[PDB]
């Protein structure tokens, strides 16, 4: 829900960020089938 | 009233599901000063928040 132009949150300002006037698409899917183990090798800043 | 308010401690806390602000931006709160806050306190079902 944070991956939007101008959003702010615990991901969407401390690391990754979309322009305040973006042109584009965001595409996401659930991946608990394959990326879960727990899997500590996924990290943020 | 009559006190200094570091919001960084609250905003960087992982304790919160939401921090939505409706006439000021939470990033800029430390750069503001105002007359009074008034904190309103209660509990509800999560589906009603």
UniProtKB/Swiss-Prot annotation, chain B:
Q: Could you give the subunit structure recorded for this chain? A: Binds to host ACE2. RBD also interacts with the N-linked glycan on 'Asn-90' of ACE2. Cleavage of S generates a polybasic C-terminal sequence on S1 that binds to host Neuropilin-1 (NRP1) and Neuropilin-2 (NRP2) receptors. Interacts with host integrin alpha-5/beta-1 (ITGA5:ITGB1) and with ACE2 in complex with integrin alpha-5/beta-1 (ITGA5:ITGB1). May interact via cytoplasmic c-terminus with M protein. May interact (via N-terminus) with host bilirubin and biliverdin, thereby preventing antibody binding to the SARS-CoV-2 spike NTD via an allosteric mechanism.
Ranges for the region named Integrin-binding motif are 45-47
Q: What is the effect of changing residue 13 to F?
A: In strain: Omicron/BA.2, Omicron/BA.2.12.1, Omicron/BA.2.75, Omicron/BA.4, Omicron/BA.5, Omicron/BQ.1.1, Omicron/XBB.1.5, Omicron/EG.5.1
Cite the source lineage.
Viruses, Riboviria, Orthornavirae, Pisuviricota, Pisoniviricetes
Measured against the full-length protein, the chain present covers 359 to 407 of 1273
Q: What is this protein called?
A: Spike protein S1
What does the annotation give as the result of altering residue 10 to I?
A: In strain: Omicron/XBB.1.5, Omicron/EG.5.1
Consequence when changing residue 13 to L: In strain: Omicron/BA.1
Q: Which domain of life is it from?
A: Viruses
Purpose of the protein: Attaches the virion to the cell membrane by interacting with host receptor, initiating the infection. The major receptor is host ACE2. When S2/S2' has been cleaved, binding to the receptor triggers direct fusion at the cell membrane. When S2/S2' has not been cleaved, binding to the receptor results in internalization of the virus by endocytosis using host TFRC and GRM2 and leading to fusion of the virion membrane with the host endosomal membrane. Alternatively, may use NRP1/NRP2 and integrin as entry receptors.
